[PDB]
Design a protein around this ligand. Structure first.
Ligand code: SF4
Ligand SMILES: [Zn+2]
Lengths: 149, 58, 191, 555, 72
């Protein structure tokens, strides 16, 4: 099949770590001899099989920045919010970006530790207010509030 | 299942059904799941959502 | 105007003393005035159990009110929504007095560490009152011996923890500093 | 605005471009290329040749405008900035804006040879006092303290890591502190200075020792105490008004730095940073702005006021507090301008009334003569549109939001003019926050629906390049056959310097009278000083500047 | 908050507490003050972190002597 051998050869371009020759790539697989693989490599954006000699070089929610993610939170004011999935699909390592855009700039929800921060898309203003001592957290909510009257 | 064999066989299976359920494809393979899953990792592009959820793609 | 400051007012309590997701429930109240619980469950993609108590923290602290949104859908089924209402003036009541008492509490540990009250025989494992003390001090003695150890005591509640509480007091004022006048900013209108 | 190197010209913000050229050729960085070859430090390639050929005479015979200077210097491998910055001592007439005669960080190159016996003209001098207010103003934010703590921590490593590199260079600058204010190599330089001085041009600064902070390690000692003290003074309960002298006293007890040593931070930072040959400056940008405040706090008092609001009132009750400091008396920078100058002229066609200017800035005029446009044709119709199609009083004083009783009248005004008026219509809203709700709610109804088809509408936007692209596509439309309408802000950038000829404007609309009370009590605190130091009340000051802003836009 | 620099105050305060007899401002001279400031920085900064605090304890020995100078 054309795709299977082409996939292995194109995957071999980045694995070798070298821009191996156009033909010498095929003999390394020893089975891929079609021109569609060469056509695909020539059609490959990641595999820079340019007009020159054989050169084997490696390469939804387009919000790849905290500036763009902040805009997403701005677009979802009084609106719904996706959790974390397409956010990291269009931008690898959102979680570090979440902490960098802290204090309601990447206002997420750390749903679980093993969930890779299954975030939430919400938009706050100051967000963090972490300076409150957890003792004052203890001291704030132990208060019996009078009812209607 | 060799990586080239997985690459050809999975593509042979993906040519039959690349847009197939991730559970259904494995039962169509029934081999040591590391080989079939690994071939899905480079010789396919995962679509977790949508109508073709968990369906191999390229 | 003022009610907008009330809208932002509860954010102070919610984003300081609670977690990150607690404003995510509160934000939805400001997001939709009649906030359906079934919708708010989807908005943050949190299940029924995870979203439940979050409203209660806003309900209990007089910040929110889950209004019983009973209505008749076309199917004639038992339709209920916990419409998290925003009771703005009553949430002011909760934040106002909660700031009031905590300042007293951190003061209390200061005075207690400045007035030794009891005693202790750490040898006989016995703590004593001063009245207990004045029973076993001998006229030939300067410190009240014991009755199981016949040994002197130690003063109780000395002043080595006194300095601990002032930082708690100072941290209380410096962290509640954004909150105190934010209530009084609203209390100018009393709405 | 005058850079020619493609590497430098890419960046948008002026300071980043200014930093890149300065780091390209700096008194301590450019030396590291000539004496030892390296790829870490490049060359401007235009200051390089200016350093060789340009500073020997004047430009041949051209009186170069901005358009003309750009074209000439491009072909002749010269950067026009370094020409005119040097041309101060050679230009029989010097062309620059108000800031470079008033702003203290940039007006250190002023030459008395061109200042003593010269004649000074202030163009559009109606907006003179407002600029001076910004000159002594600075805010802070809770995000910035995180950067400030970053700069405080990162410089602590920076000054210590270079100690093992060259410790004697560290101490060599210490003996430069006991001798004086580093005058030999802090002011007699071509490129060295990095930290700007917000104080008056070196006259309001003693030359004594900056306390016992000479040591690199001991410099960390008071830096970390003072940064902690300001943070609890950054999380203040609400806006509190204390005399800036008192801030030093409260600082004095919490962190014992005397007032005279604290005035010496600005010349200290350049004295210390230069020794470390620092290579990374991103987290150190907070250092120059905070230390700019440090020079201001120890020097200015009893004329200004310190305020710390725990949030912005439009987004109240949030951890976004400000170290608000704003100038109350603009004349402190104004008076030394008149102190040295002998020939001065102030002229503006929008100043009204013309009488509070001498009392506000404390300067001596002699000829107060007013001019009326004597023409055989009217050519202008100033209008007082109190009543609309509904014949209802229209304004923007009632609120800063939209309402069907009001918005339908203003939109009906815009469409009715769009049917009849010729090409060129410019409006100036009181504020940009006001307009965003105006246009979006206008889009909700079909009021703009007929306005859509009449003319070509381009909107004022926060990004200057887009608005300039919007405005450059406004003038061409106006000159072209199709009609065009521009919408802008009375407090926006358009009212500053933009001109509108016949085509570019025929009928201008003014939605209300612009009152700047929308912001927090910062201006209310500012307005109080005007009320007691001067006999100009809130009512007299508010309407007269608002119409001055109104008359600024109309002409 | 760089707890190493937290001890800088205590070293500095101990000079403000015990070693206050040092002639920095009472002497009047700027040259004497400037040398005193450099000497103050020599004692406090080394006593602040302590990377070379072997004469800093001796500076404490002199500081205690300065306290006796205040005392006597
Ligand atoms: S050398 Fe001149 S033109 Fe080049 S970056 Fe520097 S200032 Fe700009
Ligand atoms: Zn006992």
């Amino acid at each position: 099949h054309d795709s299977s051998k082409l996939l292995w050869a194109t995957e071999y371009i980045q694995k070798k770590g070298k821009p191996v020759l156009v033909n010498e790539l095929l003999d390394y697989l020893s089975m891929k001899k079609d021109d569609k693989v060469i056509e695909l490599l020539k059609k490959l954006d990641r595999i820079e099989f340019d007009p020159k000699k054989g050169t084997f070089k490696y390469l939804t929610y387009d919000v790849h920045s905290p500036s763009e993610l902040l805009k997403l939170l701005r677009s979802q004011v009084t609106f719904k919010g996706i959790s974390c999935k397409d956010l990291k699909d269009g931008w690898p390592q959102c979680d570090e970006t979440i902490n960098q855009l802290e204090e309601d700039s990447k206002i997420l929800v750390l749903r679980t530790k093993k969930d890779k921060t299954p975030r939430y898309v919400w938009y706050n203003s100051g967000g963090n207010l972490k300076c409150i001592d957890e003792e004052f957290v203890k001291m704030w909510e132990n208060v019996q509030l009078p009812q209607f009257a | 299942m060799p990586k080239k064999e997985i690459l050809d066989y999975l593509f042979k299976l993906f040519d039959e059904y690349d847009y197939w359920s991730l559970k259904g494809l494995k039962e169509r393979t029934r081999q040591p799941e590391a080989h079939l899953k690994e071939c899905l990792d480079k010789v396919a592009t995962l679509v977790k959502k949508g109508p073709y959820a968990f369906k191999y793609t390229l | 105007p003022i009610d907008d400051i009330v809208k932002n007012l509860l954010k102070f309590v919610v984003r300081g003393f609670y977690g990150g997701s607690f404003v995510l429930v509160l934000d939805a109240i400001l997001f939709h005035s009649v906030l359906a619980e079934d919708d708010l469950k989807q908005l943050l993609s949190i299940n029924k159990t995870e979203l439940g108590p979050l409203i209660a923290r806003l309900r209990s602290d007089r910040l929110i009110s889950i209004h019983k949104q009973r209505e008749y859908p076309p199917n004639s089924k038992s339709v209920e929504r916990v419409y998290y209402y925003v009771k703005y003036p009553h949430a002011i009541d909760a934040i106002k007095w909660k700031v009031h008492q905590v300042v007293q509490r951190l003061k209390d540990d200061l005075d207690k560490n400045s007035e030794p009250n009891g005693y202790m025989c750490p040898i006989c494992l016995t703590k004593y009152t001063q009245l207990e003390a004045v029973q076993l001090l001998n006229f030939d003695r300067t410190e009240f011996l014991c009755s199981l150890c016949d040994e002197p005591l130690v003063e109780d509640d000395s002043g080595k923890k006194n300095k601990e509480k002032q930082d708690k007091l100072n941290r209380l004022m410096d962290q509640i500093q954004p909150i105190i006048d934010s209530l009084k900013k609203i209390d100018d209108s009393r709405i | 605005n005058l850079c020619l190197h493609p590497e430098v010209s890419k960046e948008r913000k002026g300071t980043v471009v200014d930093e890149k050229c300065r780091r390209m050729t700096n008194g301590q960085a450019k030396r590291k290329l000539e004496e030892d070859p390296e790829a870490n430090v490049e060359l401007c390639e235009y200051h390089e040749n200016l350093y060789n050929i340009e500073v020997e005479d004047y430009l041949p015979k051209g009186v170069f405008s901005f358009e003309k200077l750009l074209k000439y210097c491009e072909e002749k491998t010269l950067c026009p900035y370094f020409i005119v910055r040097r041309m101060i001592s050679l230009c029989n007439i010097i062309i620059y804006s108000y800031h470079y005669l008033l702003d203290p960080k940039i007006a250190e190159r002023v030459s008395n040879e061109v200042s003593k016996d010269s004649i000074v003209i202030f163009d559009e001098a109606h907006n003179i006092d407002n600029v001076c207010i910004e000159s002594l103003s600075l805010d802070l934010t809770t995000d910035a303290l995180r950067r400030a703590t970053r700069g405080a921590n990162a410089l602590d490593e920076r000054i210590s890591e270079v100690r093992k590199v060259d410790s004697q260079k560290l101490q060599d600058e210490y003996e430069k502190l006991v001798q004086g204010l580093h005058s030999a190599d802090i002011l007699t330089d071509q490129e060295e200075p990095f930290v700007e001085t917000p104080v008056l041009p070196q006259d309001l600064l003693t030359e004594a020792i900056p306390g016992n902070i000479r040591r690199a390690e001991h410099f960390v000692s008071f830096l970390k105490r003072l940064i902690e003290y300001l943070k609890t003074r950054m999380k203040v309960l609400h806006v509190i008004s204390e005399t800036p002298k008192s801030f030093l006293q409260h600082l004095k007890q919490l962190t014992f730095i005397e007032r005279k040593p604290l005035r010496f931070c600005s010349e200290r930072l350049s004295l210390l940073v230069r020794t470390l040959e620092v290579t990374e400056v991103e987290d150190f940008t907070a250092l120059k702005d905070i230390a700019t405040f440090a020079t201001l706090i120890s020097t200015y008092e009893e004329g200004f006021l310190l305020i710390i609001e725990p949030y912005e009132i439009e987004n109240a009750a949030v951890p976004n507090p400000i170290m608000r400091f704003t100038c109350l008396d603009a004349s402190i920078a104004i008076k030394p301008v008149f102190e040295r100058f002998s020939s001065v002229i102030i002229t503006s066609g929008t100043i009204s009334p013309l009488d509070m200017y001498p009392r506000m800035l404390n300067f001596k005029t002699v000829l107060q003569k007013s001019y009326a446009m004597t023409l055989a044709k009217k050519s202008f119709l100033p209008m007082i549109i109190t009543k609309g199609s509904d014949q209802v009083a229209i304004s923007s004083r009632f609120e800063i939001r939209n309402d069907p009783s009001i918005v339908r009248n203003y939109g009906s005004m815009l469409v009715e003019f769009a049917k009849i008026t010729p090409d060129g219509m410019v409006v100036f809203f009181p504020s940009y926050l006001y307009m965003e709700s105006i246009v979006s709610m206008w889009q909700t109804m079909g009021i703009l629906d007929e306005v859509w088809k009449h003319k070509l509408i381009l909107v004022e936007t926060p990004d200057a390049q887009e608005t300039s692209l919007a405005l450059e596509t406004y003038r061409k439309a106006c000159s072209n056959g199709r009609g065009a309408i521009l919408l802008s802000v009375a407090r926006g950038k358009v009212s500053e310097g933009i001109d509108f000829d016949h085509q570019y404007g025929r009928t201008v609309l003014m939605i209300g009278i612009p009152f700047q009370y929308t912001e927090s009590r910062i201006l209310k605190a500012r307005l109080e000083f005007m009320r007691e130091n001067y006999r100009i009340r809130e009512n007299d000051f508010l309407s007269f500047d608002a119409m001055r802003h109104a008359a600024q836009c109309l002409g | 908050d760089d707890v190493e620099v937290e001890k800088e105050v205590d070293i500095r305060k101990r000079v403000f507490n015990v070693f206050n007899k040092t002639i920095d401002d009472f002497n009047g001279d700027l040259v004497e003050y400037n040398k005193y400031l450099e000497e103050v920085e020599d004692i406090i900064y080394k006593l602040d972190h302590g990377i070379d605090v072997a004469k800093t304890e001796e500076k404490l020995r002199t500081y205690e002597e300065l306290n006796k100078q205040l005392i006597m």
